Design a protein around this nucleic acid. Sequence first.
RNA 1: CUGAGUUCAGACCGGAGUAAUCCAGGUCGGUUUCUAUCUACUUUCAAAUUCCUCCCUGUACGAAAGGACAAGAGAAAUAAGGCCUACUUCACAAAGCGCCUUCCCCCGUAAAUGAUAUCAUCUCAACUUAGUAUUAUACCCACACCCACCCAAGAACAGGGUU
RNA 2: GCUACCUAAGAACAGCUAAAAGAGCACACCCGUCUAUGUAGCAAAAUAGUGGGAAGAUUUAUAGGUAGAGGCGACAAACCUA
Lengths: 115, 152, 304, 217, 108
Amino acid sequence: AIQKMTRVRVVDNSALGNSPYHRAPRCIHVYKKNGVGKVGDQILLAIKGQKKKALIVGHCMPGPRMTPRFDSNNVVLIEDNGNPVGTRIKTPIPTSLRKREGEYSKVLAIAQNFV
Amino acid sequence: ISHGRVFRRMGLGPESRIHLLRNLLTGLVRHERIEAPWARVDEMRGYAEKLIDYGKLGDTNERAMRMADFWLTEKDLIPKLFQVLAPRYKDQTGGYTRMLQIPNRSLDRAKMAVIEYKGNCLPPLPLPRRDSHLTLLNQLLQGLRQDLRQSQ
Amino acid sequence: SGTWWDEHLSEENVPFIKQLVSDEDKAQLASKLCPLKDEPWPIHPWEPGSFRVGLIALKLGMMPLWTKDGQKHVVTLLQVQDCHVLKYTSKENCNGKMATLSVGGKTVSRFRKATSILEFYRELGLPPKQTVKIFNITDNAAIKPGTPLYAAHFRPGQYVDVTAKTIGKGFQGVMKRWGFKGQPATHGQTKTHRRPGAVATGDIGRVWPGTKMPGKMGNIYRTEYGLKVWRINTKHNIIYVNGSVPGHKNCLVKVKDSKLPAYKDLGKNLPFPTYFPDGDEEELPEDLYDENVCQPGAPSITFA
Amino acid sequence: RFLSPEFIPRRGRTDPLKFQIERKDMLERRKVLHIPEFYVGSILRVTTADPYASGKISQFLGICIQRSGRGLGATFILRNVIEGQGVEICFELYNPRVQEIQVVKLEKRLDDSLLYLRDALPEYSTFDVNMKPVVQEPNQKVPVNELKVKMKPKPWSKRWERPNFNIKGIRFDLCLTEQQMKEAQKWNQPWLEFDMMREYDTSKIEAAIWKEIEASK
Amino acid sequence: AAPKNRRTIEVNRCRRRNPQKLIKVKNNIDVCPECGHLKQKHVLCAYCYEKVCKETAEIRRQIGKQEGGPFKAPTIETVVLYTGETPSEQDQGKRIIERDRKRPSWFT
RNA sequence: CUGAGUUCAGACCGGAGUAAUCCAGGUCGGUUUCUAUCUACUUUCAAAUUCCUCCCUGUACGAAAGGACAAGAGAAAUAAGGCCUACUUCACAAAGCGCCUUCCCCCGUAAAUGAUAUCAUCUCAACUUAGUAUUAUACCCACACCCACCCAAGAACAGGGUU
RNA sequence: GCUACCUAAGAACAGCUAAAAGAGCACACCCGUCUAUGUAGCAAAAUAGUGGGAAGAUUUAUAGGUAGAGGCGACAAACCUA
Ligand SMILES: [Mg+2]
Ligand SMILES: [Mg+2]
Ligand SMILES: [Mg+2]
Ligand SMILES: [Mg+2]
Ligand SMILES: [Mg+2]
Ligand SMILES: [Mg+2]
Ligand SMILES: [Mg+2]
Ligand SMILES: [Mg+2]
Ligand SMILES: [Mg+2]
Ligand SMILES: [Mg+2]
Ligand SMILES: [Mg+2]
Ligand SMILES: [Mg+2]
Ligand SMILES: [Mg+2]
Ligand SMILES: [Mg+2]
Ligand SMILES: [Mg+2]
Ligand SMILES: [Mg+2]
Ligand SMILES: [Zn+2]
């Protein structure tokens, strides 16, 4: 569960995510009617003094049984149009995204590992 | 809500509850018959049977010894448990204690109960007894029982 | 003076009486196993608009169930225990819209029942039952009293409504009873944490009827609508119903067909009056499954 | 003789028949899919079909860290560090999508729960995905790994130093001071051990389970 | 929050003479067959129990006398013998308690 | 229940005043207690809304750009009512962060036939359809002893079980 | 005999760091920052936690002095038997 003002780990090849900064990227907003964000939920970050859209790919909070649980809250940066900012995802990505409603094909394509 | 809560809240808290029950149990092992408030007696009863079971488990057993050492504050009672109480009940698998309600306490009008270990040396309690077989109702039913067994 | 059954009985008479009454109950139950062999009430074919009798079941508990698509559904187990039709009332006699069947479930002690109830059951020739519930039926769905009811009355794929008394939470405050937000912990808030705020408005010098206030919650009848029957166990008389039914485990629930307009006329394939095992046409297996249900003993499912 | 944890019911007011029904169902599933003997210390590889893909086969290897739940719904969490990222998956034993369960290494740790591995160094939670299984001889007691794990700095997911957790598999000496030890000991509850009405004797129960299991076979 | 008005004796009588407030008659009372004093059913007869307790106290006084000081609980069974009684085969190897009075009828 | 202001007992700044002191100016600090007598009320219940995605369909429409409505399907969020198989807080149980269920319409107008006013005219003309009208159905419903004991019932009382 | 100040002759201040002090941490002791409790209370000002000081312009026992048009005051119109 990712809410407003949740510190977040960017799992991406993108320069914006990986570049050193004094503060960790923080969730500005969750694009869901309830504030709570899960896997496949688009969020808005404060990263490097700019507002940027991101997609959640795993989190610490437990979910359904067979679904994986990650030790860190993991996001992938996306532009307003919907394409990913970064080229590659090294961190393993759950396969539950495929069936979920939304634009997940781009992210799965650039992903290398699935858990 | 207290659905499926099996232990009473007594004393000054959980530890105090254990200590209160321990004292009642020590009293019971020594005296073989104890007057106390009904609820406290009812709470202690379970522990009384469990203690006899650990007594049966053996003198040599270290686990049973540790339990006996805890529950019996007076140490002289620990031999008694292993060598007197446990051999007494070797035949039966349970029902070591007998609990009966007693007229309310004078001072505070508390519901009271007597608890004893069965087969004690002490004078027998005025236990409630079911009606004699020779009563009118019992005679009629004995007639019925006879008729049924004759039918078969 | 107050009297109970075994007050005046001897030491040896108590076990004898217990045995005698238990055996009579067993005999009476066993007597009613063949309703069709006894003179039945006429059996009519199912018609649109017709409503059949339901059952009284005991809530055993819950277990998971899986489907071929891979989705997990939790189910509640309802065991049918000594469920008999007790009474029939005509529409004119009931002074109501429909004919009624009183149906009882879960046999109980004769010693703990009132004389009136005991007399009624004596006339029936059945041991007394814990709960009696009334089912509104059409005339063509009438069943002779004394007729046993079984879990196979319901069939997988059918939707049912379940009614029971909810778990009683006793006297509860507004937060647990009505989900009131309460007041903050710190920043003052002297004695206001869980209290109801403003109960009413200033202008009205009173409190409206039916305002949400602290009181007794639970221990009232509620109905769960549109629960799917996933599985029947004919041997133990178990109904597997989708999701959760009201009440604690080992309580008695009233199970009837769904009243929801979607499932209005889906009673075509169901046994109309009831299921009669003594009929013995196509003897049902131990377990009846829905098509989607992953049966135990089936091979591991692959999503192809 | 090893009995699977789920077979033994938690105490309550549940009708015994409910357990009988659930047990028979469990036993049919066991006939189809062999569920091997494993403990919390044990390393397992689970083969599963995923509904999200078109019947593709997924293997996941990791150390079991928790066995919980009873009956058909029984689960086990197994944990592994995959390319820097620590992942736990909670597998249902009687889920029909579970193709195969393999015990790569069979062992017990000092503690019944290994949730403290979350706060331990990553090395203890990292296992090779392609490790070959080690076979135990038919007649031998299951080995116990007396491994004490080193820990990360003090802020932890749970206060493991507290006696309620009763953790015997952490080098507490390294990461904690004696002051912190005595602070933790204030929560001791010494009486709790000797409370003999809280004890649940699963002797007769297990015997009845075993009768039903041998009947099923 | 203070009363706005004095409550009358009429209203007060209605409150305090309500059946709810009244003492309920007890139907548990029966004659104890042993002594003839009244006992509540479900409860041990007060008189009979007092008698038993008096005797128990006397025996306990004797037990304490024979033991001598604290922490002297015997590791053998105990038996109580009155005047004109000798230990039996069963009573042999048991602690003997001597009483100066005769056997009670109820004591067996 | 609680900020601030009126608003002050202490203090300073700017201005006024011989001063004491003042400001209709600014800033810091600063105590309202209540055991409910009466009225009223304390599970009316059994009817849920909405968004998004897909189909239609990339259709009708339009020169293109763009881009529907009905009907249907799937996913959610909230609300109301429940529940504990799992997960999580925990452990004979209570909970949510978990799971389950959720049913009718609204009336403004759009039209036929047809007089006053032999055409026409939807009619505070008689009238005819959309129009649905009073929704309805669901739930509840038998009553020992009121020793005692137990309880998933409960403040007490009451209720369920004791074969 | 409270309190403000003074006079006479007294008493108290663990432990640790310190070139060594109206120094620091910190007991006892003195005070009363903030919160909660209490509000006919344990109490006509308290309790619990948290705080400020704690070799000194320190704290404190005893006896004496200053008296209302007045005393006394590190001025708060403070204190001078609620
Ligand atoms: Mg209780
Ligand atoms: Mg108390
Ligand atoms: Mg709150
Ligand atoms: Mg408070
Ligand atoms: Mg206050
Ligand atoms: Mg946490
Ligand atoms: Mg302040
Ligand atoms: Mg009753
Ligand atoms: Mg001097
Ligand atoms: Mg010093
Ligand atoms: Mg200093
Ligand atoms: Mg200092
Ligand atoms: Mg001064
Ligand atoms: Mg001044
Ligand atoms: Mg002033
Ligand atoms: Mg004065
Ligand atoms: Zn008597």
